[PDB]
Amino acid sequence: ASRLAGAAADLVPNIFGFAGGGSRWGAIAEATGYVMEFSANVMNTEADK
Amino acid sequence: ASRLAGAAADLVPNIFGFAGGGSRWGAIAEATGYVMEFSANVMNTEADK
Amino acid sequence: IVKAGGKEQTFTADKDVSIQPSPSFDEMNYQFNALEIDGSGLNFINNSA
Amino acid sequence: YKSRLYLLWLEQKEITKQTQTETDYRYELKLAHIRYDGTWNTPITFDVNKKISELKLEKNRAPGLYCAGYQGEDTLLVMFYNQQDTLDSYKNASMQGLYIFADMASKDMTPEQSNVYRDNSYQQFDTNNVRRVNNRYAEDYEIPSSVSSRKDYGWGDYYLSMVYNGDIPTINYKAASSDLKIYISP
Amino acid sequence: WQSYRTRLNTLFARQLVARATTGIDTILSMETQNIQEPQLGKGFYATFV
Amino acid sequence: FIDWDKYNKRYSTWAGVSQLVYYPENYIDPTMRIGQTKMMDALLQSVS
Amino acid sequence: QSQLNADTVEDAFMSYLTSFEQVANLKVISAYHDNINNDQGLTYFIGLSETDAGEYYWRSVDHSKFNDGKFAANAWSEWHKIDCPINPYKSTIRPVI
Amino acid sequence: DDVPLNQDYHAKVYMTFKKSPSDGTWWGPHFVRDDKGIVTINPKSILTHFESVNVLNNISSEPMDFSGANSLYFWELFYYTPMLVAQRLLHEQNFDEANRWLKYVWSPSGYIVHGQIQNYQWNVRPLLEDTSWNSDPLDSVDPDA
């Protein structure tokens, strides 16, 4: 829930004025990549239990 | 598949207007570096199994 | 023998082959011509014949 | 497409044009498929910005997206349209379409080709308040181009000979009104 | 190579997808091993007895 | 004879599948099920 | 592992068949022949996977293993992976020795 | 070729042996392709060294090559994968499934595909036809090569 909230917040552009844009386009693929790397640590923690 | 999708999305420039550009040039080398660090955890997980 | 719905249609190799192959025990390839099948009268059960 | 679940989705990208600055939008068509282990491949980007700009759309209206498989010719039929009120308005509406082949290579649809795929699939388009589901495309029939696998065989008398490893490498058809003809070359 | 044509890729995995919807009994049959590949450019097949 | 090598060659396997129509509750496992969701797999691991 | 039922060997086969698909669907981009003449030496190819921000492979064919109108299957090596941040422009990429 | 070198014939195949070791004039199949399609044989051909030379006109595809470029991956899919898993299941005393994977290479009781017994006992067709895919087996001490 924190990776999906940080991904959609970074898809909004943050630079305004005479030069617009600034949003990170690979934000959803960064977020889903961090969850699947963290779920590998969860399944190792559940296996150690 | 999420590192290669996040790398190519960040090679597209995100800042438009009177000052263009904004793409992260080391995006593919960041993505392949994250997969080889994660595959070292996979081979340790397969060895613990 | 082509049984397409209503009536059986029989096509023999004396009239429907351009080149008869050489006699052999191993292989005899009888390539016919473009044969005429009357598709009118197919029994379409569940929209398929 | 070829018995594998794909996904197509249209993304916009908010760019900044100049004259002072204004906000323009750039459209891309993405495409991903499922693998054998249940995982999904990376999305493949197709530039469809000229196709969306050719459609005289409104301000905040997403265009209609037709997508259907077609077993003959092995193409993925992707067409864009301006979304209308009634279903009868698509008998003359201009389509902006493209092909997608098996190796993710794209070819644009000629406007004489887009009218052929429109006239047999306009009853599956979306209207403004009715959201429909696309079927697999076909023009009046669905007959294979070749049959090379048998259904049944049998041995000769006294088990000496055999009729075996035949095929029908060419199957053609053309049909008038209520008259089907099949051309096999077995 | 000056007179010969040597295949580099394969289109086996393109037509393996229809053989893989049923299961491994359909993947590891002989009808999958009879999946054909297109010819190399302009030419023809000739049978020499 | 399609099912010969599995459930018809031996007697102990023939009485396994043929009783499964009449009394399947002798073979129902509350923890394992053919076709269970991934949530039921995550639930069993939380109480394992 | 030890506990190896019918469900495990089918999930491992489909994970095998996934990686089999990536190698069978490679697109040969360019090549280089490591001799003056085409009759002798050995030619090195380069491939392209069907992923976006794709990955490049390479292999070899030996022209000294060409016999009677056909390469022997010993001429071909396997596709070897290149772990390198490569992003060429319109398939402008060349191997060289 | 896209443009042939000769109009009277576009390809010349011929056969050499001990008594006839070299090429002769019009001593072979001479194939001519029109601008439409079908390849025919030029009737000035002399087919003495052959029995019959047929032209497969509507066959535009060949089956998969178990001795070609992607041969190593083809043998690993259909032979080395069912033999690795069934060996591994045999070591684990899982017998009813180890029989299922040995019968993806060889079933001595035959194969039944849609209610009918088949013409083969070897499920791997480059074992059905003995296709050699290594002609240098004595370079190194390798029991597989």
Concatenating the DSSP letter of every residue in E11-45 gives -HHHHHHHHTTT-HHHHTSSTTTT-EEE--SS--E
| CB contact set of H39 (below 8 Å; sequence gap of 6+) | E44, H10, H31, H32, H33, H55, H57
- B22 and B15 Cβ atoms separated by less than 8 Å: yes
Secondary-structure breakdown of chain A: helix, strand, coil percentages, each rounded to the nearest 5: 60, 10, 30
**CA D80 to the chain's CA centroid:** 11
Q: Which residues pair with C45 in a beta bridge?
A: C48
Residues of chain C with Cβ-Cβ distance to H52 below 8 Å are 21-22
Other CB atoms closer than 10 Å to residue B8's CB: what's the count?
23
Residues of chain F with Cβ-Cβ distance to H98 below 8 Å are none
Nearest-angstrom CA–CA distance, H111 and H116: 8
Nearest-angstrom CA–CA distance, F33 and H12: 67
Nearest-angstrom CA–CA distance, H59 and D167: 10
Instruction: Identify how the structure was determined.
Output: cryo-EM
Nearest-angstrom CA–CA distance, H125 and H67: 12
As a whole number of Å, the CA-based R_g of chain E is 15
CA distances, C41 to each of C4, C46, D53, H16 (Å): 8, 15, 49, 56
Neighbour-count burial for F12-36, b at 16+ CB within 10 Å, e otherwise: eeeeeeeeeeeeeeeeeeeeeeeee
Q: Which DSSP symbol is given to D73? A: G
Nearest-angstrom CA–CA distance, G48 and D103: 11
Closest chain G residue by Cα to residue H86:
G9
**CA E36 to the chain's CA centroid:** 3
Two tokens at B8?
């190519």
Nearest-angstrom CA–CA distance, C2 and D148: 16
- E30 and H125 Cβ atoms separated by less than 8 Å: yes
Q: Which residues pair with D30 in a beta bridge?
A: D9
Q: Which of H67, H73, H89 sits opposite G4 (nearest CB)?
A: H89
CA distances, H112 to each of D125, E1, H116 (Å): 45, 44, 5
Two tokens at H105?
């290479």
Q: Contacts for E19-22 with beta carbons within 8 Å, 24 or more apart?
A: E20/D36, E20/G17, E21/D3
Nearest-angstrom CA–CA distance, H46 and C20: 19
Nearest-angstrom CA–CA distance, G50 and D147: 30
CA distances, H21 to each of E47, H17, H43 (Å): 22, 5, 24
Residues of chain A with Cβ-Cβ distance to D16 below 8 Å are 19-21
φ and ψ of H140, to 5 deg: -130, 165
Resolution of this entry, Å: 3.2
CA distances, C24 to each of C15, E4, E43, G22, H89 (Å): 21, 31, 27, 44, 47
φ and ψ of H133, to 5 deg: -125, 30
Given CB atoms, is D170 within the 8 Å cutoff of chain H? Answer: yes
Q: Contacts for C42-48 with beta carbons within 8 Å, 24 or more apart?
A: C42/C4, C42/C5, C42/D180, C43/C5
**CA A25 to the chain's CA centroid:** 11
Ramachandran quadrant class, G68 (left: phi over 0; alpha: psi -120 to 50; beta: rest): left
Find the farthest-apart pair of alpha carbons in chain A and give their distance in angstroms, rounded: 56
Given CB atoms, is H63 within the 8 Å cutoff of chain D? Answer: no
Tell me whether chains A and B touch (3+ CB pairs under 8 A).
yes
Other CB atoms closer than 10 Å to residue H71's CB: what's the count?
22
Q: Count the residues in chain C.
A: 49
Tokens 């001595």, residue located = H108
Q: Which DSSP symbol is given to D34? A: B
Candidates C17, C20, C22, C25, partner chain H, best to mutate (most H CBs within 10 A): C22
Residues of chain C with Cβ-Cβ distance to H58 below 8 Å are 31
φ and ψ of C32, to 5 deg: -80, 175
Which residue type sits at D67? C
Given CB atoms, is D149 within the 8 Å cutoff of chain E? Answer: yes
Secondary-structure breakdown of chain D: helix, strand, coil percentages, each rounded to the nearest 5: 15, 40, 45
